[PDB]
Amino acid sequence: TTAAPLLALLRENQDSVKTYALESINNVVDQLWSEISNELPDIEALYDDDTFSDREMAALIASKVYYNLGEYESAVKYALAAKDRFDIDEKSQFVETIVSKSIEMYVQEASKQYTKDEQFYTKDIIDPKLTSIFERMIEKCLKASELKLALGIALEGYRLDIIESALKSKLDQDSTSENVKIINYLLTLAITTVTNSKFRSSILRKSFDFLMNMPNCDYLTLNKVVVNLNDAGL
Amino acid sequence: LTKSLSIAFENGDYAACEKLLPPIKIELIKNNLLIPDLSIQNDIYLNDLMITKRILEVGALASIQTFNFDSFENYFNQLKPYYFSNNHKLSESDKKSKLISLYLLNLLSQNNTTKFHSELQYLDKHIKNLEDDSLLSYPIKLDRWLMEGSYQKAWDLLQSGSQNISEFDSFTDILKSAIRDEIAKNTELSYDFLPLSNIKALLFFNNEKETEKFALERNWPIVNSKVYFNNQSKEKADYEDEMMHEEDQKTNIIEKAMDYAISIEN
Amino acid sequence: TKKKNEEINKKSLEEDDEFEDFPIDTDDVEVDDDFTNELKAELDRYKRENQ
Amino acid sequence: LHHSEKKYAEEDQVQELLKVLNEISKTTLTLDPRYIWRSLKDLSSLRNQELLNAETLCFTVNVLYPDSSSFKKNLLKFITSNHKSSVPGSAELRNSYPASFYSVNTEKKTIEVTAEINCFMHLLVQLFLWDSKELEQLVEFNRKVVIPNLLCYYNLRSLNLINAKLWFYIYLSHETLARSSEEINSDNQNIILRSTMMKFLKIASLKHDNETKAMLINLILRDFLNNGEVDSASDFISKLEYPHTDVSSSLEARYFFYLSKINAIQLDYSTANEYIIAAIRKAPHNSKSLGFLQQSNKLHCCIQLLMGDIPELSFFHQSNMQKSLLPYYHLTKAVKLGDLKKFTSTITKYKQLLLKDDTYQLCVRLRSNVIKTGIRIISLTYKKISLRDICLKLNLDSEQTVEYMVSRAIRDGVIEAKINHEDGFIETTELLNIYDSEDPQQVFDERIKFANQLHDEYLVSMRYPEDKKTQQNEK
């Protein structure tokens, strides 16, 4: 259909017709996506006003419009603007476009700010929406329950608590050897991947006590940690 | 309720119509749920679509006369896909024909020959011989004489348009003004001097004093019965020359050597 | 056999070939100017001479 | 007799199938499967005709089928059902080998090797449908099936290269029904066709498949054109993303034609000139692409005359395209001789033919162009001419009328003159010696820059195949 009808519905003066127009647009937002792209200022204008009880909806419409056009940055920021109604994306596997975007961006910021203070996450320097999204993609990896995925996203972003906490929940000594092998990968991964001097050292030192905790543990794995830090005290 | 609007138009108070339209817009949500939004038509559905169109139609027409551009464009916007859909069964009317004419005349008045030709392609099959050319003929003729650039024919058509006015006057008055600016441009490149009479005759003013008045508004001085196109035109180019975009657009010969080298050495 | 898919696909977008549809349904202009010139030369001449 | 030929036909398909299967299932060697897949289509369409066309039926019977059997029955039903040992799985010659697909393990769901074989079957059916000219029930059924079949998958780049062909027949089949035959329902399902193309288009950026993305843009634009939505096309192309990288030069020619058409009607002729010339070059010039060429050469001429350029009379003559370009020839002359009345009769006479290609609406604009040209002839021939003399020359009504044609024309610089009111004549003003001026410098500069671009394209292309060869073992 022409998108043309909707665009005129938005142009009417009174707020009442404008509010209604949103709903009809949202069911045809991906169909007619191409036409509406040209009409991005109206979508922004609706959002700015505070009369609308569909203010969240309007930001979400824009979000959609921006990713299809190909401006990925503007889309993810608009995703946290709405905040809610982002539910639809969380439970659809055909649009995880904005979510995946969120991780790429979030980690790059976090790595840079690690060097300043390593508790950057516990500060609100990170936006509060993003803090919620990051922990929920970690949760999807845990759903599949291979712990390696969970560890890998955090290893790149130089999250120090997450490396620790993952290992503590898999301390349970069902078989001591299996526990040890997931650690074997993690020690190796971190040398060849992590170059940032501070992040790497720190998780290595923590992992030494985690192996020592188990009364029975392979020591090939363990020896690597001590010689790398080269602390006689260890 | 829905009929109160139809009778408000005939009364003649077209401001009553406008004040009544925010209430009837709420009822336009209901008409929309009745129709499946253009996804299959049946005999339940043809009535429903019909009521939706009646409300819009007297609104289209009312807005035009009250020079309220916004409302007209929207109402019309809706009318367009509805009429376009489907096979004939009641999807054309006398009201359609009038509405498209008025629409095309707005586009001629904004001087947007770009959209007009495109809009004509979209419309094409419906106006070929199933509304024909009767009222729609008025802008088609009008485009033809100004492309040829016989301003004499064009002008004559608007005045003689008096016997055709039905609400056409909202585009027709404007379309005179548009003619004056196109001609005004032309006559500069040709010459520098016209007598008083000649200025009036080309631009089609009916008053000689109104001529001289227009000349000041057009930023032309007429002195001792002669235009002196010489001033402003030169002034404008000198003013245009100061701006900022500006080095690569103007093109420097210096720049040509610099750009050539870095191509090679890359 | 590779190019062939494309040749058939183009034809179909045209529909048939118009090429053969048209016959089923249904300064090179410059006259010899010698003839006109003959007339011109003679009329001018008659007057010129007896002037 | 029958049995023999059917079998033979069957064998041939099976050979081809295994080879392309091997290639894909043994690492990503992408180019090789793709080049192969295009040639196979031609080969398959050519095959069917002889060795009997129940090659398909045989092959379906003898796979680990999911609903291909159910499909096949629908196909036989349209064109009258028969039974001659066509019960699904009446043929077992698979015989528990992985090669032709291990019968037991597929059924259990410990392996699913049916995947690409089902995709391939849908391709064979589509292809066979259009060749045959089987329509109605099948088209609908086929469209229905395949759309959810693709959305079950979460495609690989290699599998997407394959649906890059399937959507062209999907588009085309829908159109054939819409084109035969008036329906309200055709109109309704045109909306739905757009919608799905657009959905698949967003996905194919992320999947990084240049081939698929291109194809979809060809289809969508063509759709806007038929229903005459120029506005829709103009918006769609400007979020430009169409790659010239992986795509066939067959596809490039179609793409550039759509560009040209939309520019034509809004009076932009500068951009339309270049795109049109390119599609001519790009197109393979062969016996059956000749239809495309004809349609295009009718447009290219229109674009030129509108610009104000005059196409050769020589061109139409020595071409093997003479007869179709008969109307065209009459227009070219009519503008040249500057006769308005003849122009008017000519487009009326040819009205039906022109109208099909929809170049007719362009022809109507060509009414101005006749007159304008006549005013250039007069300026060139006679530098200083009383305005009285032009009126007689072009048969125009009065002194005031010619005033008005020249005046509009010199704004556009066609004539390039100025009227001298006082003296009561017109002066040509273009009087050459632009050498002395800075002008040649400007001219050459563009040429120099253009060479450089051709160099970079040349350099780039040349080196790439060597690299692949050198790495590979070679004697």
Kindly write down the DSSP assignment for every residue of B189-242, as one continuous string: HH-S--BHHHHHHHHT-S-HHHHHHHHHHTT--EETTEE-THHHHHHHHHHHTS
Taking 3-state DSSP, the helix, strand and coil percentages for chain B, each rounded to the nearest 5, stand at 70, 0, 25
Task: Report d(CA A111, CA A102) in Å as an integer.
Answer: 15
Structure tokens at D220: 């969508």
Q: Which of A2, A16, A20 sits opposite B81 (nearest CB)?
A: A2
Q: Are B232 and B220 in contact (CB under 8 A)?
A: yes
- A20 CB within 8 Å of a chain B CB: yes
Instruction: Provide the 3-class DSSP secondary structure of residue D420.
Output: strand
Distance of residue D324 Cα from the nearest chain C Cα, in angstroms: 6
Residue of B nearest to A21 (CA): B29
Closest residue by Cα to residue A109 from A67, A72, A156: A156
Residue of D nearest to B257 (CA): D445
**Where in D359-472 does DSSP place strands (E)?**
384-386, 417-420, 425-428
Residue of A nearest to B24 (CA): A17
Q: Are D279 and D296 in contact (CB under 8 A)?
A: yes
Q: Are C45 and D82 in contact (CB under 8 A)?
A: no
Closest residue by Cα to residue B187 from B158, B223, B151, B157: B151
DSSP code of A153? H
| C-alpha distances out from residue A41 to A19, A31, A46, A76, Å | 16, 20, 9, 18
Which helix (DSSP H) or strand (DSSP E) does residue D180 occupy? Answer: none
| C-alpha distances out from residue B242 to A20, A201, B230, B245, Å | 49, 61, 20, 10
Size of interface B-D (CB pairs under 8 A): 102
Closest residue by Cα to residue D312 from D285, D332, D292: D332
| C-alpha distances out from residue A183 to A208, B258, D419, Å | 10, 59, 92
Task: Report d(CA D56, CA D73) in Å as an integer.
Answer: 12
Residues of B in contact with A20 (CB under 8 A): 29
Cβ B75–A7 below 8 Å, yes or no? no
For testing contact with chain D, the best of B147, B199, B263, B265 (most D CBs within 10 A) = B147
D159 C-beta neighbours (distance < 10 Å), count: 18
Task: Report d(CA B150, CA D378) in Å as an integer.
Answer: 18
Distance of residue D207 Cα from the nearest chain A Cα, in angstroms: 12
Residues of B in contact with A4 (CB under 8 A): 77, 80-81
Residues of A in contact with B71 (CB under 8 A): 12
Residue A168 burial (C-beta neighbours within 10 Å; 0-12, 13-18, 19+): exposed
Closest residue by Cα to residue D375 from B149, B35, B174: B149
Cβ B190–D411 below 8 Å, yes or no? no
Chains B and C, touching by 3 or more CB pairs within 8 angstroms: no
Question: b/e string for D398-408 if b means 16 or more Cβ within 10 A?
Answer: eeebbbbbbbb
DSSP code of B86? S
Strand order in the sheet with D384-386: D384-386, D425-428, D417-420
Task: Report d(CA D209, CA B168) in Å as an integer.
Answer: 53
Q: Are D231 and B115 in contact (CB under 8 A)?
A: yes
Task: Report d(CA D255, CA D215) in Å as an integer.
Answer: 9
Distance of residue D217 Cα from the nearest chain B Cα, in angstroms: 20
Task: Report d(CA A125, CA A110) in Å as an integer.
Answer: 10
Task: Report d(CA A120, CA A124) in Å as an integer.
Answer: 8
Task: Report d(CA D284, CA C8) in Å as an integer.
Answer: 12
D13 phi-psi bin (left φ>0, alpha ψ -120 to 50, beta other): alpha
Question: b/e string for A117-154 if b means 16 or more Cβ within 10 A?
Answer: ebebbeeeebeebbeebbeebbeebeeeeebebbbebb
Residues of D in contact with A34 (CB under 8 A): 198, 232, 235-236, 239
Cβ A5–B38 below 8 Å, yes or no? no
Cβ C6–D291 below 8 Å, yes or no? no
Q: Which amino acid is at B114?
A: T
Cβ B70–A17 below 8 Å, yes or no? no
Instruction: Provide the 3-class DSSP secondary structure of residue D385.
Output: strand
Beta bridge partners of B195: B226
Structure tokens at D17: 């199938």
Closest residue by Cα to residue B31 from B44, B14, B19, B15: B44
Distance of residue B68 Cα from the nearest chain D Cα, in angstroms: 24
Task: Report d(CA B91, CA B41) in Å as an integer.
Answer: 12
Please report the resolution in angstroms.
4.5
Q: Are B264 and D448 in contact (CB under 8 A)?
A: no
| Long-range contacts (CB closer than 8 Å, 24 or more residues apart) made by A68-73 | A68/A30, A68/A33, A68/A34, A68/A37, A68/D202, A69/A37, A69/D239, A70/D205, A70/D239, A70/D241, A72/A101, A73/A105
